[PDB]
Amino acid sequence: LQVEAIKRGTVIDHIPAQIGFKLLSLFKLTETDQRITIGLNLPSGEMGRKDLIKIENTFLSEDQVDQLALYAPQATVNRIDNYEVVGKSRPSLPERIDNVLVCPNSNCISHAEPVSSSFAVRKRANDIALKCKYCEKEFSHNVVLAN
């Protein structure tokens, strides 16, 4: 392999192309002292091209794995221990996205006040609609920006 195996931690495989970097940026995954190995634009038999993120001595809860669903719905999260895959899971669409997004309603109380952002998530047509906990306005995920 071009990106070698790890002893212990999490391997996020099958990330769509151009999404791997977005995931590192959004979830601040590089803000750690743990060893990270990343492959971008790797070939895949299943997806064609794919990104890959490996984070040692770091683990993701089901909730944290679910947060990936908005960006990599068909990703695989491998829990590694003693060089062994001891668990595989796929992201499921979460009930909400907290902290990382910014409400696009400029008159929302969330901008002025010391609260964390929070949006309810639902499937609308073939899109993802986000409804702000505070202002209750609803937006396409496309127009809800990150911090």
Partner: protein, 310 residues
């Protein structure tokens, strides 16, 4: 305890049909048989961070009719939030150590919801948060619709004016959608249309609704003509073409109205309802406003008093 005891009252979206019916039943009871000492020894904050006549004065009157005391402000300019830079969060954190409930109106959407995250065990009652929700308006509206039509189901309801920014119609449409077989007519300029999240909610529930460009189209079949003011203080400068009321109801427009039809308006009105409407039997906006006392007494009783009033 009753289902609403110590509950926050933020959004109609959080309430069920049973909740709404409970408030109205309680309102009917207190109207027939006042309980002047029900909330004796309560102190309630009336915190208005934007303008109000009806909502603040009827809430405070209701508090006194129930024996409760009132503290607060009708203007934020002379609070420490107004002059010393204090957050809304800290304002709620201290006020909630003083009072048994907080009634608040605020110009930003989501303010009431935020307050609940800092108020601890003290209930927050949303008297209006930006263009979002106005639950107690909806309670009095429902009471008024029920009074004049005899039911809350199978009604033809037209809503006119600024539907985009009317917290009134956001709350009211959600509420009536919890009842069966109601039909909606939306008469708005395109720029101030009813928001998509409301329409999606109607579609999921199989509720019929349609857009119309004139009151006359639907006058013959409406039971409730709910008029609204253009919310100019919420408009973007790019929406300034709609400042002036696009639909003006006058007495001659009511010729083919059903006998039972009432004209409602949460008020204040500018010119969207001509004064010649005032004396016709269809005008019910002042009666509506007076119903705010019964609805708001009811809500206060249910939130602050453990047992059901009978």
């Amino acid at each position: 305890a009753n289902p609403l005891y110590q509950k926050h009252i933020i959004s109609i979206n959080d309430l069920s049909r049973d909740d709404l019916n409970l408030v109205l039943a309680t309102a009917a009871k207190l109207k027939a048989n006042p309980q002047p000492e029900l909330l004796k020894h309560k102190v309630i904050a009336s915190c208005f961070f934007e303008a109000s006549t009806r909502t603040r004065l009827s809430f405070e009157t209701s508090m006194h009719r129930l024996g409760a005391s009132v503290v607060g402000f009708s203007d934020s300019a002379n609070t420490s939030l107004g002059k010393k830079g204090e957050t809304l969060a800290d304002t709620i954190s201290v006020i909630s150590t003083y009072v048994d409930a907080i009634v608040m109106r605020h110009p930003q959407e989501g303010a009431a919801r935020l307050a609940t995250e800092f108020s601890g065990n003290v209930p927050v009652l949303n008297a209006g948060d930006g263009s979002n929700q106005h639950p107690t308006q909806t309670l009095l509206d429902l009471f008024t619709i029920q009074e004049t039509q005899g039911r809350l189901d199978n009604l033809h309801v037209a809503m006119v004016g600024d539907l985009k920014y009317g917290r009134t119609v956001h709350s009211l449409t959600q509420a009536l959608a919890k009842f069966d077989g109601n039909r909606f007519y939306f008469i708005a300029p395109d720029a101030l249309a009813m928001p998509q999240y409301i329409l999606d909610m109607l579609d999921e529930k199989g509720i019929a609704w349609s857009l119309h460009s004139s009151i006359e189209e639907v006058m013959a079949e409406v039971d409730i003509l709910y008029m609204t003011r253009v919310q100019k203080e919420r408009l973007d400068p790019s929406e300034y073409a709609n400042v002036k009321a696009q639909f003006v109801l006058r007495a001659s427009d009511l010729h083919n109205a059903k006998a039972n039809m009432k004209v409602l308006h949460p008020l204040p009105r500018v010119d969207e309802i001509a004064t010649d409407v005032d004396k016709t039997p269809h005008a019910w906006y002042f009666q509506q406003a007076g119903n705010g006392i019964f609805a708001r007494q009811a809500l206060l009783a249910l939130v602050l008093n453990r047992d059901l009033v009978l």
